Enzyme design. Structure first.
Site, mmCIF file in Angstrom:
data_model
loop_
_atom_site.group_PDB
_atom_site.id
_atom_site.type_symbol
_atom_site.label_atom_id
_atom_site.label_comp_id
_atom_site.label_asym_id
_atom_site.label_seq_id
_atom_site.Cartn_x
_atom_site.Cartn_y
_atom_site.Cartn_z
ATOM 1 N N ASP A 159 11.368 10.323 -32.711
ATOM 2 C CA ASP A 159 12.170 9.770 -33.808
ATOM 3 C C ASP A 159 12.539 10.857 -34.824
ATOM 4 O O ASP A 159 13.558 10.748 -35.487
ATOM 5 C CB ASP A 159 11.441 8.624 -34.506
ATOM 6 N N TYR A 172 4.734 5.361 -38.375
ATOM 7 C CA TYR A 172 3.558 5.849 -37.681
ATOM 8 C C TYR A 172 2.610 6.461 -38.712
ATOM 9 O O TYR A 172 1.413 6.153 -38.706
ATOM 10 C CB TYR A 172 3.965 6.829 -36.590
#
Ligand SMILES: [Fe+3]
Ligand SMILES: [Fe+3]
Ligand SMILES: [Fe+3]
Ligand SMILES: [Fe+3]
Ligand SMILES: [Fe+3]
Ligand SMILES: [Fe+3]
Ligand SMILES: [Fe+3]
Ligand SMILES: [Fe+3]
Ligand SMILES: [Fe+3]
Ligand SMILES: [Fe+3]
Lengths: 296, 296
Positions: free
Chosen positions: A76, A114
């Site tokens: 990402d 995350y």
């Protein structure tokens, strides 16, 4: 001689302002509407409630999670800061350029989620170990550099292929772990964050694949066949590397065989998103029910 | 399978994942939380409730409104698809890159906001005439291209000065109109959208200016003097251009002199964002407190 005169010359058409009242491709608006409407931030999910189950997880599990999540975070980071961005110049419409800016931002939000998970459940040595592991790992760095070579290249269609494969394929060796754990009542809040991310990535891969398809049909018979060949070639390359990467992550766990099937299942979906038939027979994509279930 | 080999070969450095657990510049986190916490979409404001006010407006007020918003749309289009993006490669931290992806996306939301207002209040002919007007207005195209010339250039610091001047100065000849009308109880819901936009631009200008200061402080005292010289010369050129644009827009209504004071007031803020003293003395920057408040 103004430091800008030379420029104003090389570009004589008027700079256009985006007009959302005239839309050539309704698809851009449907997607803009779906992505912005699906806006979310990781802070809205109570990840602190997974602290108990995170403790109940075996050492090998915690370890696999740290690494998988770091690999996802890395994908990402590339997609948000380099990928989505590289597609801007080749947009067919200005509305499409707007969609890519949403995609770029949502990718930074994904990467950050995350960190929100890690910081709530893990320890700094764990976090630090995970991140160092991600820089050293040959398969992860390899897939990150193959995708980047295209974003940095000069081929608009190739960039879209790489992006659709990253969104529809590379992310899943990773989403498997949280779907596995959550069906077994482990890290359920965290799985909710993963589900919001998946809701974005499925749209991202669908939309970018759609734009590749419209672009490719604008080519001659021969070129179209060359791009088809190019896509399957990269898909096999990425797939082989993902196998080696999967072995290293899940073998201690022994989830490997089921994960490999999950990979073939998504490799096919990625090829369909690009308008091509799958690369793997259906019988070879029989992922455990509990996994594809956790998803939907 | 071979094609991406030279790229890897030359890029033997590890691709890094972003880590929000370790923030080298705390400002990046502060701006990220501020910008994401301020997320908004134009669909959220009842613009349709301005229909009565709009219809009561004179043809001149309507015409000026259409033109200033198409001008504002053009600047956001540029900033979102060209500007914020051109700053990613020069970022000092990865979290700063993440911030720029949010800026890029919010600029697209800004640009889209003008269309929601148009589609709700103006006739299509008015809308088409306005965009056509923006493509042909010499002063508007000149400021668009001067700024674009720097985003396409190769000097990282000048991209930041141009961006900051865009964010904190160039939008203001256009922001004057809704703020003033708002102070007369007209188009008040449209004004709420404008206030949400300003709340964003204010932070964009401040943040990008702050990163410019950080980079310029790294150079020798002499080079620092050349960048100040360059910044003021660009401000002089943009200001002179902006006065003409202002005249084109506001002369009919006769608000020109007040809009020019407002341009001077904001030109000082833009310079302050870049770390410099203002250009215009206070007595030349008088702005009605009803417009200032209508701002915040
Ligand atoms: Fe993502
Ligand atoms: Fe994505
Ligand atoms: Fe192996
Ligand atoms: Fe092998
Ligand atoms: Fe093997
Ligand atoms: Fe804006
Ligand atoms: Fe802005
Ligand atoms: Fe004049
Ligand atoms: Fe004049
Ligand atoms: Fe003049």
């Amino acid at each position: 001689s103004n430091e800008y005169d030379e420029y104003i010359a090389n570009h004589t058409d008027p700079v256009k302002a985006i007009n959302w009242n005239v839309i050539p491709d309704e698809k851009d608006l449907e997607v803009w509407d779906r992505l912005t409407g699906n806006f979310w931030l990781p802070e809205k999910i109570p990840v602190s409630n997974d602290i108990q189950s995170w403790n109940k997880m075996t050492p090998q599990e915690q370890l696999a999670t740290m690494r998988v999540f770091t690999g996802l975070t890395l994908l990402d980071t590339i997609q948000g800061t380099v990928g989505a961005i590289s597609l801007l110049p080749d947009a067919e419409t200005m509305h499409e350029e707007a969609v890519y800016t949403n995609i770029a931002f949502m990718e930074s939000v994904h990467a950050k989620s995350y960190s929100n998970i890690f910081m709530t459940l893990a320890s700094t040595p764990q976090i630090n170990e995970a991140f160092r592991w991600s820089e050293e790992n040959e398969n992860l760095q390899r897939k990150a550099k193959i995708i980047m070579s295209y974003y940095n290249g000069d081929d608009p269609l190739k960039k879209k292929v790489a992006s659709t494969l990253l969104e529809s394929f590379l992310f899943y060796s990773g989403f498997y772990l949280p779907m596995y754990l959550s069906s077994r009542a482990k890290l359920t809040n965290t799985a909710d964050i993963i589900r919001l991310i998946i809701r974005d990535e499925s749209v991202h891969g669908y939309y970018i694949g759609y734009k590749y398809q419209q672009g490719v049909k604008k080519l001659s018979e021969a070129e179209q066949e060359e791009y088809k060949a190019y896509t399957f070639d990269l898909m096999y390359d990425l797939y082989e590397n993902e196998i080696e990467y999967t072995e290293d992550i899940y073998d201690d766990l022994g989830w490997t065989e089921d994960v490999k099937r999950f990979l073939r299942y998504n490799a096919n979906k990625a090829l369909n998103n690009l308008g091509y038939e799958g690369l793997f027979p259906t019988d070879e994509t029989k992922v455990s029910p509990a996994i594809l279930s956790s998803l939907s």
